[PDB]
């Protein structure tokens, strides 16, 4: 002779349609576990192993869940998977003042104007460090 009440509320989360990492509309297949995650960073985040960003080439759409290969736009809904589409890194991110470095072969965040790439060092460096940073090592006395 007693009436109870139902409980156990729940919440929601955001994943696809562009994650905190990047803004894309297509999940990249995982040739490691045959799974699909917003971005490469997400995979590892929801997995014990790390996924590659170069190996995988195929991609799936989130607008019309249509299958397709590495591209910038869909072939069924023509939904921009990202203003910027890389072929080497196979990454798709919205216009976030980012540029792809050839010397490194990886995507980087600009604005390129306030940035540059050193040879001797073989890496990207911000203008703020134009000279201050060292490239070659030298000096007998240590400490
Ligand atoms: Zn995996
Ligand atoms: Zn992500
Ligand atoms: Zn689509
Ligand atoms: Zn790239
Ligand atoms: Zn670079
Ligand atoms: Zn240097």
Curated annotation (Swiss-Prot):
GO aspect biological process, one term = protein autoubiquitination
- The segments annotated as CHY-type zinc fingers are 12-79
Instruction: Recite the UniProt keywords alphabetically.
Output: Cytoplasm, Metal-binding, Nucleus, Transferase, Ubl conjugation, Ubl conjugation pathway, Zinc, Zinc-finger
- Binding residue positions for Zn(2+) 6: 118, 121, 133, 135
> Which annotated residues bind Zn(2+) 2?
32-33, 43, 49
At which positions is Zn(2+) 4 bound?
Answer: 86, 89, 100, 107
Q: What is its main location?
A: nucleus
- Specify which residues bind Zn(2+) 5 according to the UniProt entry for this protein: 101, 104, 117, 124
Q: Name one GO molecular function term.
A: protein homodimerization activity
Q: Where found?
A: Nucleus; Nucleus speckle; Cytoplasm
What is this protein's tissue specificity according to the annotation?
Detected in testis, liver, kidney and heart.
How does the record describe the protein's post-translational processing? Subject to ubiquitination and proteasomal degradation. Interaction with PLAGL2 or KAT5 enhances protein stability.
Q: Which residues form a coiled coil?
A: none
Residues reported to bind Zn(2+) 3: 61, 64, 74, 77
Q: Which GO terms describe its cellular component?
A: cytosol; nuclear speck; nucleus; ubiquitin ligase complex
Copy out the induction comment.
Answer: Up-regulated upon p53/TP53 activation.
Positions binding Zn(2+) 1 in this chain are 19, 21, 39, 42
Q: Zinc finger spans (CTCHY-type)?
A: 81-137
Q: Which domain of life is it from?
A: Eukaryota
Q: Which cysteines are joined by disulfide bonds?
A: none
> How does the record describe its quaternary structure?
Monomer and homodimer. Interacts with AR, MDM2, KAT5, PLAG1, PLAGL2, COPE, UBE2D2 and GORAB/NTKLBP1.
Biological role: E3 ubiquitin-protein ligase that mediates ubiquitination of target proteins, including p53/TP53, TP73, HDAC1 and CDKN1B. Mediates ubiquitination and degradation of p53/TP53; preferentially acts on tetrameric p53/TP53. Catalyzes monoubiquitinates the translesion DNA polymerase POLH. Involved in the ribosome-associated quality control (RQC) pathway, which mediates the extraction of incompletely synthesized nascent chains from stalled ribosomes: RCHY1 acts downstream of NEMF and recognizes CAT tails associated with stalled nascent chains, leading to their ubiquitination and degradation.
Identification of the protein by name: RING finger and CHY zinc finger domain-containing protein 1
* Whole-protein coverage range: 9 to 138 of 261
